Swiss-Prot record, chains B, C:
<feature type="binding site">
    <location>
        <position position="57"/>
    </location>
    <ligand>
        <name>Ca(2+)</name>
    </ligand>
</feature>
<keyword id="KW-0222">Digestion</keyword>
<feature type="site" description="Required for specificity">
    <location>
        <position position="171"/>
    </location>
</feature>
<feature type="active site" description="Charge relay system">
    <location>
        <position position="84"/>
    </location>
</feature>
<dbReference type="GO" id="GO:0005576">
    <property type="term" value="C:extracellular region"/>
</dbReference>
<keyword id="KW-0225">Disease variant</keyword>
<feature type="modified residue" description="Sulfotyrosine">
    <location>
        <position position="131"/>
    </location>
</feature>
<feature type="disulfide bond">
    <location>
        <begin position="116"/>
        <end position="183"/>
    </location>
</feature>
<dbReference type="InterPro" id="IPR009003">
    <property type="entry name" value="Peptidase_S1_PA"/>
</dbReference>
UniProtKB/Swiss-Prot annotation, chain D:
<feature type="disulfide bond">
    <location>
        <begin position="30"/>
        <end position="51"/>
    </location>
</feature>
<dbReference type="GO" id="GO:0070495">
    <property type="term" value="P:negative regulation of thrombin-activated receptor signaling pathway"/>
</dbReference>
<dbReference type="GO" id="GO:0005615">
    <property type="term" value="C:extracellular space"/>
</dbReference>
<dbReference type="GO" id="GO:0032023">
    <property type="term" value="P:trypsinogen activation"/>
</dbReference>
<dbReference type="GO" id="GO:0002020">
    <property type="term" value="F:protease binding"/>
</dbReference>
<feature type="disulfide bond">
    <location>
        <begin position="5"/>
        <end position="55"/>
    </location>
</feature>
<dbReference type="GO" id="GO:0097180">
    <property type="term" value="C:serine protease inhibitor complex"/>
</dbReference>
<keyword id="KW-0646">Protease inhibitor</keyword>
<dbReference type="GO" id="GO:0043199">
    <property type="term" value="F:sulfate binding"/>
</dbReference>
């Protein structure tokens, strides 16, 4: 898995409430978080499937 | 909205909720078939929900209208956040009544010290999560350019302005973006960004709607 | 808490009970190893009880952790009650779960009119005594500095603020000291003092945690 | 016995619930009360024993 998978999720400075997924490495799963709409980091997925394929070995 | 109050005591009929299976941004009804929102709220399909107070309960005044066209400002900058504005054309005309009606475009720029009404379904907490079912309201003043710049050195473009309190405590927050800042019956701002929410010396930053009136009118005319 | 209500179970997971053989004060968990309370709650030995709802019976989610270090603010004044704050370092790290978790430090000072949640196992009667087994909650607004000063002439320092109602009826009370005043999801206050409880023109006075953020972070770093 | 000992008990303005003793009118006995943690008056004892002695 990419090292960016191990970074905490990043909401950013924009003020949307967009539900995105991030990989929680210890939990071995993709979890939801609030993304503000700009300046996304890479541990930020539009679906659980995208997240698991990229960071969960799917 | 952090530090505000339930809008049930107010009339906010121009507020819309943008929905993609859940509420993700606000917007403002400016014409029977057009909504203004933030460019960072762009999604390729959006359902506009009008007439809402409680976004979790059908109350009987809702109109749910899908977008026909979604037009982000062509010079939107995803790093600097310049030109953070978008227009949504509704697939059918909103029915205008006490619960759903338009807000006037501004005829002159934001004025320092003017009290404005900011509203939305965003987070009501500055740490953690406290998202409301019912629309929240905040009365806050336009701040001077000097204060806006001192708060965010080098990051404020000519299309941005600050509204709020340098002492923090009351601000717009995640979930509010795209929604209205109304000053004396005119739409002056679109909720945009900030350094967190309600932090000391970090008031919210808002798109200056007045800087876009010709773009809005031209876009509506070209897509009618 | 006078005029409050039974807190929902697990809704205040940062609330702790300080115990010296019995519950004598509250506190707030701010880190896995650190609790904030009031300076007048100082005792040389304190057992921190976390995950409590009914303080009289074991319900299965409790953690009892002895204080390893108890550090009262060095400028605490036992007559004026200025700097009424203390940090407790736990002898082991609290286990963070659905019942026990931390509250964020404030990123702005208290803002007039904002909504706060005050909680504790203190007296529920404004006269006489009615002490509860179950944790009590109270919704109350931050009051202006002018109202606080008017309620306690010559006694309110910049490190104090008032929350509550000039009309009385709802307030914190004996047994609540040291516990949390949470506004906008952050720890704005520590329950401190007042003239009686829930009396007219005598809202409770609270330690202004925002003024102690640097002291808290420095003390934690110096004792890690 | 000292005079302050006829004085009633004073909780004070602070908001702790600290159980203290105060020597009792004509009971000839010390009783508990809730002390708030600051501004104690003199009929306020940390144990029944030093209450009895100071005031017996
Ligand atoms: Ca509804
Ligand atoms: Ca218990």
């Amino acid at each position: 898995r990419p090292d960016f998978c191990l970074e905490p999720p990043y909401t950013g400075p924009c003020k949307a409430r967009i539900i995105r997924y991030f990989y929680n490495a210890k939990a071995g799963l993709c979890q939801t978080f609030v993304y503000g709409g700009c300046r996304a980091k890479r541990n930020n997925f539009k679906s659980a499937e995208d997240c698991m394929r990229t960071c969960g070995g799917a | 909205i952090v530090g505000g109050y339930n809008c049930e005591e107010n009339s906010v009929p121009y507020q819309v909720s943008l929905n993609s299976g859940y509420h993700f941004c606000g917007g403002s009804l400016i014409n029977e078939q057009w909504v203004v929102s933030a460019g960072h709220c762009y999604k390729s399909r959006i359902q506009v929900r009008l007439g809402e107070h409680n976004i979790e309960v059908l109350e009987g005044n809702e109109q749910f209208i899908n977008a026909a066209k979604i037009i982000r400002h062509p010079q939107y900058d995803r790093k600097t956040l310049n030109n953070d504005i978008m227009l949504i054309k509704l697939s059918s005309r909103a029915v205008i009544n006490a619960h759903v009606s338009t807000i006037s475009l501004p005829t002159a720029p934001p004025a320092t010290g003017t009290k404005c009404l900011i509203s939305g379904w965003g987070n009501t907490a500055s740490s953690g999560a406290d998202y409301p079912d019912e629309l929240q309201c905040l009365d806050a003043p336009v701040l001077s350019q000097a204060k806006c710049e001192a708060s965010y050195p080098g990051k404020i473009t000519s299309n941005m302005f600050c509204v709020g309190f340098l002492e923090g405590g009351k601000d717009s927050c995640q979930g509010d973006a795209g929604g209205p800042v109304v000053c004396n019956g005119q739409l002056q701002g679109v909720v945009s960004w900030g350094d967190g929410c309600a932090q000391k010396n970090k008031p919210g930053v808002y798109t200056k709607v007045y800087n876009y009136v010709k773009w809005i009118k031209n876009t509506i005319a070209a897509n009618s």
